[PDB]
Design an enzyme around this catalytic site. Structure first.
Site, PDB file in Angstrom:
ATOM      1  N   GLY A   6      -7.114  -3.739  -1.998  1.00 20.92           N
ATOM      2  CA  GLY A   6      -6.201  -2.623  -2.206  1.00 20.92           C
ATOM      3  C   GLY A   6      -4.859  -2.994  -1.612  1.00 20.92           C
ATOM      4  N   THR A  34      -3.496   0.459   3.892  1.00 23.00           N
ATOM      5  CA  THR A  34      -4.901   0.760   4.055  1.00 23.00           C
ATOM      6  C   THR A  34      -5.676  -0.447   4.640  1.00 23.00           C
ATOM      7  OG1 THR A  34      -4.810   2.313   2.216  1.00 23.00           O
ATOM      8  CG2 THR A  34      -6.971   1.537   2.885  1.00 23.00           C
ATOM      9  N   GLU A  48       6.148  -4.775  -3.112  1.00 22.85           N
ATOM     10  CA  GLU A  48       5.257  -4.715  -4.263  1.00 22.85           C
ATOM     11  C   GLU A  48       5.386  -3.351  -4.909  1.00 22.85           C
ATOM     12  OE1 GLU A  48       0.827  -4.390  -3.766  1.00 22.85           O
ATOM     13  OE2 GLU A  48       0.679  -6.228  -4.948  1.00 22.85           O
ATOM     14  N   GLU A  83      -8.025  -8.402   0.597  1.00 24.60           N
ATOM     15  CA  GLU A  83      -7.076  -8.873  -0.408  1.00 24.60           C
ATOM     16  C   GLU A  83      -6.136  -7.688  -0.656  1.00 24.60           C
ATOM     17  OE1 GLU A  83      -6.959  -9.598  -4.824  1.00 24.60           O
ATOM     18  OE2 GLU A  83      -5.242  -8.775  -3.715  1.00 24.60           O
ATOM     19  N   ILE A 136      -1.675  -3.053   1.495  1.00 22.21           N
ATOM     20  CA  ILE A 136      -1.481  -3.469   2.865  1.00 22.21           C
ATOM     21  C   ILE A 136      -1.677  -2.372   3.895  1.00 22.21           C
ATOM     22  CG2 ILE A 136      -0.051  -5.532   2.546  1.00 22.21           C
ATOM     23  CD1 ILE A 136       2.418  -3.850   2.737  1.00 22.21           C
TER      24      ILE A 136
END
Ligand code: NAD
Ligand code: NA
Ligand code: NA
Ligand code: NA
Lengths: 500, 500, 503, 498
Positions: free
Chosen positions: B237, B241, B394, B259, B239
Site C-alpha cells: 500500500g 500506512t 506519488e 512494498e 508509505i
C-alpha cells in the site's frame, strides 16, 4: 593488569570520521571504568548529534564515489582477510583490553579473539562467491538477471558484553559486500572497538568507508537509527532499545537487523549424561557472569532427576572462583556496571516475593578482594514455575532458575513459553529424542548435548522477540546486500494498446 | 457485465475464520462500489478487532497442531497447484469480478488472472526444492545443519489496485512454506479475494490455516500488525500506512515485509527507438489509470528530442479512449474512489501553483457515459523540475511529468533524486549505455527497452522508502521461512571450566 | 478377478512400433520380437526390432530438433507445464500402466501401483524444477567486465533402460531431459518395452515438436553402440549392469561424450544387537525379496551382529518359508517370478558357486515344484549362511531372491565388511542407538544410506553410486544437472588494445 | 638467474611424505626450448612408484587426517599455499619461462593467476557441506552430505604446467581429497617447486604425491587403478580418450579438458584495430600453444580483405626471441616433436589447397637457429571441409574464413568437433549476445579474447572435454553426494506373511 594499562598509553581517545581521528564537536568526554575495581581507566570523546550525522554523510559520500562499493569482490575479500590477519597479530593486546574494559576472564577474551579472526576470515572468503543469478525468463526475447549490490550506508550499534565480537559480526560482512559503515560501540566499553579502527586504518580503506562514533545511545543513537541516508540499521542489545530503534528506523522505511537477547532453555532429560549436563549447566549459566545473549538461564530438568541435579549444581556453584579477570585462577569476573548489578539484585527480591527460593548465592560477595568490584555471587533459584517473572524475563546475570518437567511434550511446551527465541539446548543420550525436541523448539540455534557454540559458518539470530534477521553465515552476508532485477527486452515491439 | 452482476448472486458476503464463513462480531456491513458508475454492487461484513484477534489465534492454533506446517512440502505444493488450477478454471468470472470491483479493463483483468495462475504455479513448484543446508562445522566431532521452517503465523494486507494479484504474491508462498495466514484485502475491493477464499476452501486446508478478515485498517489493522502471536506482517500500500504498520510491528519485534509504491522513472535517450519510447511512455503512465506501484509517472527525456517527444506524447494522449472496463473499445478506466480522485485533483492545483504546465488533461470528464463514474483525464505535465512536489510525490493517477536531461550522468542523478526506489526503465538502442544506467539506478527492478514486466520467477520490491524485503522469486518465498541451526555434539566431553 | 485378462485387452490398442521424428514406424528391415509374460512364459505381444540405421536416424532427428530451437529455446516455465502434463497423463492411466508393467515384468500389481505413483511424482518434481535456476551472475575480478554463467540443455541425449523397473527408470531420464530442453532418444530393454511404448503414446498426446522425443526398440547388441557412440550425442545415460555399463563408457569415449551410469550394487543391510528385532526381520525380508530381489537397491548382503546372529537367522529362515509366490495379478501374491530364462539360469548358477566355496543354502535355492508355478520363471526365496567376505556369493551381484548372512563382532567390523565390495550404491543401518547409526552412515561409501529403513528413493534427493555402482546422479537437483551444461559469457565493457605485438 | 635456481631444486618424486628416487636409475633430461640445452635432470618414475603413491593416498584418505580435518582448517592451509606462490612469484615465473619458453611477462601473469586460484578455493572450502531435503515421506529426515570424492589422480600438460596444476590441486585439497599428480614429463620444474612449497605448509603423510615420468609408462596406472575415485586430465584428445577408456575399467569418474578449435568471430562493425589486436593475441600468445587459442578466425565479408591484409602486415612484425628478453613477443614452441607436428600441418594445408599467406616455416635469423622456433603464420583461402580448419594444430597458426550473415558465422563456428572457448567482436552488443547464446562453447568472450579466472567455470562442450575446472563447479568434481535418510518413527511393512 598493569601491562594492559600500558596499552592505553598509545590508544586513541577520539572518534574516527571521514578518515580522521577527531574529538567531539563540543569537546565533551567520558570516563571509562574497569568493573573489577570501579577505577577510571581512560577518557574518550563523547560525540554529539552533529558528529553522528557527519559520519553518516561521509559514509554516503564514500558510498556514492564507488571507490569501495565498485571495487572487485575479490579485492574486497583480500582487504577483509588483511583485517583478520591484524586481529590475530594483535590478539594479546586486544584480549587484555577486552578483559580490562568488560571484566571477563582473559581466557574468555582470547577465545573471543579466535572467533573474531575466524569471522573476518569467513567473510573474506565469501566476498566473491555469489554475485546474483540468471533467471529463465517466462517472456520470450528477454534476458533476466538478479544482481546483488551492497545495501548501501549501514549504521551499527553494539553492546557492552562482547564488544569486539559483536562489532566483528557487523563490520566483516559490511566491508565484504562493499558497504560504507558507521559504528557506535557501547559508551561504557569502547576500548577494543577503538583499537580495531586503528588496525583497519592500516589495512587501508577509502576515506569515509569506515567511521567510528563514540557516545551515549540517548544522544547519538537516534541519529544513527533515524537518518534518511541510512539503508540498514544493525543492532545488538536489549529489547527496550531494539524496539525504540525499529520505530525510529520506520520513519525512512529502513531495513533493520536486531538481536535482542533471550530466555534460553537448557533442557535436561533423565537419560542425559548427568555429569556432562551439570558441567554444561554451569557453563550455560555463569560464563561472563551470565551476561551472554545465549546464556542458559532457564534450566528445565526431568522430574525423576531434578532434585539430584539441583543439589549437584548447587554443590558446584559453591566452588565457583570469583575474582580479577587477569588472575588465571578466576572462573567468573564481575558484572559490568553499578546499574546492571542493581537490576540483578532487584530480581532476587522479585523471585522471593513470587514464591521462589534462592538456593545459593543471591547477593554480593563479602570477601575483601571483591568488595571494591562489581561482583555478584553465582545464584541458583529453585521451586520456580513458568508464571514467574524470574523465569520469564532476561536477568542477564549469574543466575539460573530450575524447573521440572515430566514428559518430552511438557519440556517443549515450557521451553517455548517465553517471548524470546534465540538459543537453547537439549541433553539426552537418546539422539532420536533430542532431535524430536530440537525440531519443535522455536529457537534460532538448538544445541544437542552442548551449550554455547556459535561460529561464522552458521547463521545466528532469534525467533519472536529475540530479533529480526540473522548474523553470521551466508544469511548474515545477505543483510548487507540488495537485489536488483535487470530485465532487457532484446526484441522490443510497440504494444499499441493506446490509440494511434 | 450484468452476467458479472449475476455472479454476485452466489458470492459469499462474509469473513472466513477458523474454517467457517462468519459475520462480523458486531454485525456491521460495508457497501462495495463499482467505480465506473458509483453504484453499490455488493454488501459485505465489516469485521471487528476481536474478529481479527480470533483469526490470529486460530492461525496460531492451526500452526502449532502441525496439520499444515508439518505436512510434506510435496503435498503442500500439490495443494498450491490445485489453487492455481482453480484460478485458470475460473479465469473468465474472476476477470469480470476484478473489472467490476476495480474499474480496470477486462483485457487488463484477464492478464492479471494469467499472472495469478503462474504465481501459484511457480510457488507450487518451489515448495519442496530447498529445506536448508548442511554446514561444515569448524568444531571437530559436531554435526551442523540449517533447517528452514515456516516463519509461523503471518498477517497479510493488500491494496485496492490489483487486489487478487497482490493477494497471490502473499498467499502462494505462505501456503507453500507451511505458514498459517490471516489476510485482509482493501475494504473497497474485497470481491476477488472473497472468491479466491471460496476456491481455496474447495481445495481444502486444515481449519485455521487460512483466514479472511474484512474491514478498514483503522479498526482491524493494528491487531494484524501488532498482535504478539504474529511472526510476519506483509503489507502492500502507501508509505504512511506502511510506516505506521512497521512501528506497530516493533512492539513484538515482528518481521515486516513492505512494498510502498514509487516515483518510477522512465528514461528516454535521444538514441531510443522513438515510436517505441512514445508507446511505452503511454503504457507506463496510463495503464490502470496510472494506479500501479510501478507506473512510470516521471518521464526523463534527453534534451535534443524533448520537444519532439512531448508533442508526440501529447498528441497520442488526446486519443486515449475512456469508458466502461467491460467495453472492448476502452483503453482507460476510472480511478478507484472519490477519495482518490480528490487527491489526484488536488495535485493539479499543486502543479500549477508551483509553476508547472498542465499540457493536456487535468480534469474530470463530464461527458454522458463518464459523468457518473470516477474518471479523470489522462494528463501530461510539462515545464517542471525535480524541486516540485508534483515530480517528487506519488500521485498514483493518470498523470505523468516530463523533465529534460542533458547527459547520461544527469539522467541518473535526476532518476535517483526521490525518496523511492521501486522500478524504472531505460530506453536506448545503445545497450551498453542502458546497462551503465541500469547499474546506477537505486531501484529494485530496471527494465531496458521495456516498461512494466514482473513475473513470479524474479523478486520485486524497493530500495529506500519503497519498501523492506521482496515478493516473488526465491527471495519472496524466503520471507515466509525462518532458519534454525541445529548443532549436535557427537562426542561430548566436560569442559571443566568451573572447579570440582 | 479378470485383471490379467483385462490387462491383456489393453494390448489390442497398444502400438507395436518405434517412434522416430514424429511418426510411429516399423523397423527398417521389418524385423520383430516376441515379448513374454514371465509368469507363464507365453508370448503376449510382438514389437518392431529396430536397426542401427533407425537408431542413427532418430539421433539425427533429435539433433535437428535441438538445433531448430522449438523445444530447447522454449521458455522454461512452458517446458515445465508440458512436463506436468505428462505427469497428469501418467496418473490418468495409472491402472492400465501398472497392469502393463505387471504383465511385462512379473512383479506384483501392488508394486506396480507404487511405481506409477512414484513416476507421477518424478515428472511433477522436474516440472516444478524446470524454471528455478538459469545460471549465476559472477563477481568478475576484472574491472569493466560483466561475467555470467548461463545453464543450457546439454543437447542430444541417449537413454538406455533395464528390464526390472522399466517405466520408473525411463521417468528418471525423460523428466529432466524434457524439463531442461534436451532432445532425447530412448531405448528400453528389448524384453520389456510395453510401458515405455505406452508412455510415448501419452507424450505424443501432450505434444512436442517433431524429433524432440524418439523411441527405438531393439537389442542392445544391435542398436546400442550407435546410441553410445554417435558423434551427435552429448550425453549417454544408462541404468543396468556393470559389464554393459563399462562397454558403453568405453564407446562413449570415442566422442568424449558425457556419461551418467547406475550399475547396481552389493548393498549392505547392517543389523545391530540393539536394533528393533522384529523391524529388522521385516526389513531384511523387504530388502531381500521385493521384486524377487531384482532391484538395484536390493539388500542382498545382510551383516548381523554376532550376539544375535543365530536368533536372526532362525527368524529370517522361518519367515522366508512363508513367502507366497504366484501370479502378480493375484492379490495374495507376495513375490512373483524372475524376468527371463537367462536370468533364472544366472541365479541358479550362483547357488552352485556358493555351495562350491563352502556356504550353505539354508532355505530355498531351487525352482518351486508347485503345479501353478511350473510354467513360470519362478525361483524360491533363498537365504545363504556360513558366508564370509572372501566369497564370490557375498561379493557379486546375483540380482535374485537371495540374501547372504554374515556376522560382525563390532561397529568397526560392520563398517569394514560393508565397505569391502567393488560397489557403492545404497545400504541400511538398523539400531535404536541413533548416534551410532549416524556414525556408521557417515563411514559407509554409499550414495544412499537409510537409518532404520530399507528401499526409500524419491525425486527430491539424488540417487547413484560410489565406486563401481556408477557415475553421476539421477533424481534431485543433481539429476537435473546431468542434462545441463554451463556457459561463461564474459563481456568487456571497456575494450582496449593490449598492444603486446609490434606495429 | 633462473639457471642458479636449479641448484636447490629437487630432482626426485614425492611419495608418501618423502623425496625419493625411482627404481629406474635412468633419469630424464629436461630441456629449455629456446636453445635446446639440457638444463636439469630428474627421476623417471615407474609403474610401481605410481601404484605406491596411489596406495599411500588411499591409506591417508582412510586415516581421516585430511579428509576429516575441518573445512575451515583445510581452507587456511590452501591459503598458506597461495601465500607461498606470491612469496616466490619471481623464482617460479623464471622457472616457468626456462622450462616452457614463454615470455617472462606471461609467466608473471600465470603466477598472479595461480595465487588467486589457490586463494579462491581457500575461501570456498567451508562454504557448502550439503543440503537438507524436504522428504516426501512423513516421519523421515533427509540430508545430502557432500564428502570428498576420495583419491584423485591428476595429469597436466606442458603448456601452462603450474597453472594447470593449481586448477586441480587447489580444489582437491580444499575438499579433503588425497591426490597423486604427474606433470608433463618435459616440463616438471615448477611442479616440483610447488610440491616443495606444499611440504613447507605441511599436509598429512600421503595426502599429496608427485610422480614424475612419461604418461606412456605410469599413465595407465594413474587412470586405471581400482583405488582411484577421479581421474582429472588436461591435454590432447587422443590421450584423453585413452584415459577415459581405461577409467571405465573401475567405473571411475573422469574430468577432461582436451583443447579446442576456438573461433574468433569478427563482424564488420567491430572496433577494427581492437579486432586486429585481439586476433594477434588470440592466435600467437605462447606461440598458439593455448587450450583456448583463437586459431579459427571468422570475419564478415565487408571487412575481410582489409582485415586479412592488416593481420598479415602485423604478423610480419612479431618479435621472436628469448622469453627472458623484454623485447620478445613470442617464444619458441615446446619440443622437436611438436614443431614437427606444426610443420606437417603446413604440408596438409598446402596439399588441400589453402594459401600460406605469411609464415609457415622455421625462421632464418641466427639468434633463433638453436631454438625450437616457428614463424607466426596466417592461412587464407580455406574452408570448413579442410583438415587445417577442423584440427587442432596448437602452434602459431591461424586460419581466416569469411561469412555474410550472423547465422552463417554461428554455423561455421559450431562446425567442429570441439567446444572450448571463443569470441565475438562487434560494437553491436545485442548482436554479439545473440551469437554468444548460440555458440556451443564453455566460455564466450564479447569484445575480448583469453580471459579465465577462478570465480568462473572453464571447460568444453563436445570433444573439448568432460566436466569443469574453476568456480564452484570445479570444486564439485572433487565432491560426492550421500543421501542419509533417517526414518524417525519406523514401522513394520508386513508385506511378507508371518
Ligand atoms: N588442452 C591443452 O592445454 C593441451 C596441452 C597440451 C597438448 N594439447 C593437445 O594435444 C596434442 C598432443 O600433445 P601431447 O601428446 O604432447 O600431450 P598429451 O595429450 O599426451 O598430454 C600430455 C600429458 O598426458 C600424459 N600422458 C601421455 N600418455 C598418457 C597415458 N597413456 N595415460 C595418462 N597420461 C598420459 C603426459 O605424460 C602428459 O602429462 C597437442 O598437439 C595439442 O593439440 C592440448
Ligand atoms: Na568498561
Ligand atoms: Na516381458
Ligand atoms: Na622444458
Amino acid at each position: 593488569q598493569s601491562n594492559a594499562m600500558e596499552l592505553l598509553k598509545h590508544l586513541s581517545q577520539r572518534q574516527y570520521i571521514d578518515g580522521e581521528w577527531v574529538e567531539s564537536a563540543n569537546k565533551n568526554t567520558r570516563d571509562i571504568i574497569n568493573p573489577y575495581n570501579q577505577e577510571v581507566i581512560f577518557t574518550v570523546s563523547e560525540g554529539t548529534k552533529e558528529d553522528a550525522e557527519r559520519a553518516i554523510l561521509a559514509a554516503r559520500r564514500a558510498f556514492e564515489s564507488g571507490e569501495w562499493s565498485q571495487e572487485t569482490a575479490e579485492t574486497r575479500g583480500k582487504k577483509v582477510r588483511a583485517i583478520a590477519d591484524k586481529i590475530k597479530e594483535h590478539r594479546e593486546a586486544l584480549a587484555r583490553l577486552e578483559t580490562l574494559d568488560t571484566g571477563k576472564t582473559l581466557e574468555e577474551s582470547y577465545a573471543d579473539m579466535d572467533d573474531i579472526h575466524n569471522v573476518f576470515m569467513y567473510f573474506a572468503g565469501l566476498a566473491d562467491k555469489d554475485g546474483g543469478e540468471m533467471i529463465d525468463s517466462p517472456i520470450p526475447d528477454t534476458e533476466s538477471k538478479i544482481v546483488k549490490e551492497p545495501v548501501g550506508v549501514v549504521t551499527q550499534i553494539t553492546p557492552w558484553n562482547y564488544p569486539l565480537l559483536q562489532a566483528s559480526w557487523k563490520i566483516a560482512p559490511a566491508l565484504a559486500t562493499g558497504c560504507s559503515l558507521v559504528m557506535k560501540p557501547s559508551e561504557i566499553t569502547p576500548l577494543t572497538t577503538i583499537r580495531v579502527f586503528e588496525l583497519m586504518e592500516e589495512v587501508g580503506f577509502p576515506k569515509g568507508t569506515i567511521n567510528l562514533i563514540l557516545g551515549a545511545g540517548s544522544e547519538v543513537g537516534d541519529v544513527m537509527s533515524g537518518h534518511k541516508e541510512v539503508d540498514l540499521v544493525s543492532f545488538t542489545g536489549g529489547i527496550e532499545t531494539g524496539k525504540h530503534i525499529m520505530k525510529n528506523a520506520a520513519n525512512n522505511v529502513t531495513n533493520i537487523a536486531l538481536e535482542l537477547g533471550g530466555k534460553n532453555p537448557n533442557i535436561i532429560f533423565d537419560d542425559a549424561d548427568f555429569e556432562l549436563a551439570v558441567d554444561q549447566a554451569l557453563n550455560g549459566g555463569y560464563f561472563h557472569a551470565g551476561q551472554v545473549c545465549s546464556a542458559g538461564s532457564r534450566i528445565l530438568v526431568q522430574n525423576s532427576i531434578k532434585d539430584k541435579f539441583e543439589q549437584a549444581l548447587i554443590d558446584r556453584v559453591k566452588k565457583i572462583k570469583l575474582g580479577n579477570g587477569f588472575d588465571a585462577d578466576t572462573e567468573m569476573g564481575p558484572v559490568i556496571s553499578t546499574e546492571h548489578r542493581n537490576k540483578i539484585e532487584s530480581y532476587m527480591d522479585v523471585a522471593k516475593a513470587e514464591g521462589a527460593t534462592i538456593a545459593v548465592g543471591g547477593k554480593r560477595p563479602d570477601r575483601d578482594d571483591l568488595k571494591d568490584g562489581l561482583f555478584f555471587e553465582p545464584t541458583v533459584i529453585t521451586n520456580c514455575d513458568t508464571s514467574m517473572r524470574i523465569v520469564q524475563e532476561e536477568v542477564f546475570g549469574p543466575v539460573v532458575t530450575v524447573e521440572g518437567f515430566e514428559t518430552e511434550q511438557e519440556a517443549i511446551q515450557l521451553a517455548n513459553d517465553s517471548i524470546y527465541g534465540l538459543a537453547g539446548a537439549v541433553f539426552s543420550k537418546d539422539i532420536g529424542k533430542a532431535q524430536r525436541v530440537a525440531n519443535k523448539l522455536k529457537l534460532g540455534t538448538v544445541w544437542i548435548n552442548d551449550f554455547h557454540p556459535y561460529f561464522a559458518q552458521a547463521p545466528w539470530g532469534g525467533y519472536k522477540q529475540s530479533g529480526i534477521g540473522r548474523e553470521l553465515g551466508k544469511e548474515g552476508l545477505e543483510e548487507y546486500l540488495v537485489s536488483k532485477h535487470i530485465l532487457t527486452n532484446t526484441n522490443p515491439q510497440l504494444v499499441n494498446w493506446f490509440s494511434k
